[PDB]
């Protein structure tokens, strides 16, 4: 089960491959490396073999090579599934880092949503601008038609938020695709 | 597994048997239609095979006619569980539809309680009088035996609501009793 | 310039044609007849030639007929642009009724979203269910890959309100697709 | 898959010994009565064989006798653990009572915290002393090494919100260590 | 129609020149990269031929090079413009990026007044100070003779506020100055 | 007395080693700068000699490569000290810098806990992260097994309340367990 997806524009070039069943083997490497510390917990958390390499105009902001990573992975992963057939479709899940809880339900079945309600107090985690988390996840949404909910419970520090919601949005990916349920199809 | 219960009244006359242990298939006509099309969240998704044959007066107002179909489905899933035994007794589980969370919790131990916390803002459906909502699983908790917690996250659509804790009763319902521990007995 | 999409499910069956280079012709009959005075208006206002036929169960609630043409109006939208080349891609406009002004803007550009910020009155205009406004152009929106912000500045009336909307979100189709600037491509 | 902790100061001499892989087999007789009914949950819904016997100062106040039977019980899980592979590591789970949820989040990794949430209305149970049940937590939580998240969610019995807590700790204990991912390790 | 200004002071090294009437050409290289992706947004939706060289101390803040900047494209602006015959002298338009709305409106005739009701919640874009967005149109105001009206109506994303701001001015530009109405002057 | 621990993960590479009886010496080169002008308080004002060798992915944030000194200070201190005997035992005080007093209390016996009370007003001091230093003191609180309380009682300037806190908590670390009482044991 594989999907990969390359695409390049004047801006970026952005070559991405997922496949959905597999190990905790990662890969993975932007323009800015924050990211690529946050693809490292979808792939051994979530059990998947993602594969990015994107190259792009990181002289001036990172805004535009953050959503062609994030809308080319919602591209590749609506290609790893076909017609949805014997699959759980429902995939929720909360996860504790220090301090901080983050709730993320998903639903996979057509229609795009983003619910956020995630409030970080700073504006630079290392050098990642911030404002840019919940538009990986809206550029995400948008293209693998997928319902939503990311939901901060507690937790007050940027760099723990951030990587418990990356953490619960990968258990609640291998939860709503990846397991079976008893029915055939 | 099953369980059928038959009652009759001087208002209603209702028919209802349920395969706990079954597929995903459905025939149940209510006199109001509605009704019918959230029967089928808990036989789809609940993987159970549900039968419910209710004639009663829509003459008069729809409030008789949907106590004792939910009256009948909780003798016969009172009758479809035994002396319980090596189940898991324990069902949570939320489920998003379009910007609609719910989150059901349930028990099935003997003793009854329905703690209620939605808000929907219309007062029609499409002739569903709405308020018949929380009276379904008043009158499904009282004869099951079951305590039952539904908790409304997010969301302002008044079917987008109603179906997603039918969608979320179906899948917390099918956790509890149907599936099974490592323990015998 | 002609876009048509057929679209069958279990639950309805729709046929939707769009001439987006067109006259004011119009025959488009839903299931529910308040839907075919709003279509007008896209029609006459527009200069669209919209043709849309869909069979679906209103023996139920109106929701999911209101779906199913919304989203085929879109796919049918999004086929009949081609690879966007020679058009003004920006569409804004204001029109009154009696008391009541929408303020509608849109981008027709790949990426999705929708801000609604009416507020009507009363519940039912003449049957039509009135929280389902929005979702017609929620699902117009995620198949036509557009941004679409409507905004109303004065009125209540709910006839008023929902009139005014369509026949300035027509205005605003027919300046950013089917007009053309200066320049070629 | 067993720890065993002795461990006795000039307050409380006390015993601990824990099967982690186990059944519903329960013997634990502190020197307060109370906990030996909360011990029992843990042994029942958490499938986990636990063995305490401590003798300590109840002479005077209870609550040097439930540091060291919990500071006890935190060394043997810990030890019960070896080099940690090939466990989920991820433990959430919400268990109603009669009116009462509580929501039990862990995570098992080294760091310790204890976030606790809980508002208990009376001072007294039977005769414990009721301000020691977060004491009970914080004492597992720093020899455990463990981030754990308890909060209520609604409900007003002093007996009915800690037997709400010690049934969801010990589903969300046997979700995290006992049970195994399709990983290795 | 061009206007070309050289302006050297001893702090920045400013050349500018602007065709008018023109196509959606653009080189134009500031000292600080972030101008560089807003100044091509006044050359393909304004459909100017813009012209920037600036060389200045970025060795300390970008305060000193984006107002020589600014001012040097006003003086060139004045300078395209002669005497005003013939045009319509009027601009107005909003355009929606990704959830912000901005409306820019603009008059062209002599008096300089700058109205500026945006808000951004960051500090920084990618490096660009942020704080200097209004005292861009401030300096571009007092020597091109205009007044200008900039007003936000949704939107929370810094990158998305200006550049929905340099889309809307732009084509405000080109309404008002390069198309001409039916009269001859 | 000399505690010395070695420490590598897949992140960090961290060597530290610290003789608790000793004179105002400090080679301690951490990843990040501003790490080693807060090392030197604990050396010259405490008069310990620590030492501290780590090599970390400052690539990315400055996160991981603070919690694995901090971790490692605190090994090394809990293997500095012995059978805890003939030992003050409680170390308290309060230093000024300009402006600015923090009080630090601890205990150094068993049980972990922090409490954290200041509110530094900027997000970096050169360029550190300054939501690391609560961070510090949690991770040297954990693996010490020290009560500590730390408060704010006046002061608004970034470097001079970490500088304030760090000359305190040198001073009240000297004092209770480096200086002894008139008992032996
Ligand atoms: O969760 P872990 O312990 O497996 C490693 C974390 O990814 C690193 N970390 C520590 N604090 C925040 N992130
Ligand atoms: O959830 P789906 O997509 O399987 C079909 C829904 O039952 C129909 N629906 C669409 N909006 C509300 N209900
Ligand atoms: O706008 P008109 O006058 O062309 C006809 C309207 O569509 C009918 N109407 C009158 N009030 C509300 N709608
Ligand atoms: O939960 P049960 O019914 O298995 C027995 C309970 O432990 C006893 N109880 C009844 N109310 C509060 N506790
Ligand atoms: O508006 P577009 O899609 O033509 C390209 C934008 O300039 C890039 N962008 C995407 N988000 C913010 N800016
Ligand atoms: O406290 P001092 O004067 O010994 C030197 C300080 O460490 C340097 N300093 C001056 N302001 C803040 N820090
Ligand atoms: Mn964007
Ligand atoms: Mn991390
Ligand atoms: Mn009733
Ligand atoms: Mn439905
Ligand atoms: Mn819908
Ligand atoms: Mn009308
Ligand atoms: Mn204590
Ligand atoms: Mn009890
Ligand atoms: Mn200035
Ligand atoms: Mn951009
Ligand atoms: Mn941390
Ligand atoms: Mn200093």
Redesign the interface.
Same mark, same amino acid.
């Given at each position: 089960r594989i999907g990969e997806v390359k695409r390049e524009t004047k801006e970026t070039n952005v070559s991405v491959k997922i496949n959905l069943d597999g190990?905790?083997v990662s890969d993975s490497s932007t323009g800015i490396? @924050?990211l690529?510390?946050m693809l490292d917990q979808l792939a051994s958390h979530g $059990?998947f073999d993602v594969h990015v390499r994107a190259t792009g105009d990181t002289?001036?902001?990172?805004?535009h090579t953050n959503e062609d990573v994030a809308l080319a992975i919602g591209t590749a992963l609506l290609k790893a599934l076909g017609e949805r057939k014997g699959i759980n479709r @429902?995939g929720? @899940?909360?996860? *504790?880092?220090?301090?901080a $809880?983050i709730?993320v #339900?998903?639903?996979l079945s057509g229609?795009?949503?983003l619910?956020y309600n995630l409030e970080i107090?700073?504006?630079?985690?290392?050098?990642?601008?911030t404002?840019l988390v919940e538009?990986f996840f809206?550029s995400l949404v /948008?293209t693998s038609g997928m319902? $939503?909910?990311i &939901?901060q419970?507690?937790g007050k /520090? #940027?760099?723990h938020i951030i990587e418990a919601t990356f953490?619960a949005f990968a &258990?609640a990916l291998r939860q709503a695709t990846e397991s079976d *349920? &008893? &029915?055939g199809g």
């Open positions: 190990h905790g490396p @924050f690529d510390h $059990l002289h001036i902001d990172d805004h @429902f929720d @899940f909360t996860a *504790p880092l220090d301090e $809880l709730h #339900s998903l639903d229609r795009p949503y619910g107090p700073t504006q630079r985690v290392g050098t990642y601008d404002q538009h809206q /948008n319902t $939503l909910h &939901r419970l507690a /520090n #940027s760099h953490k &258990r *349920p &008893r &029915r």
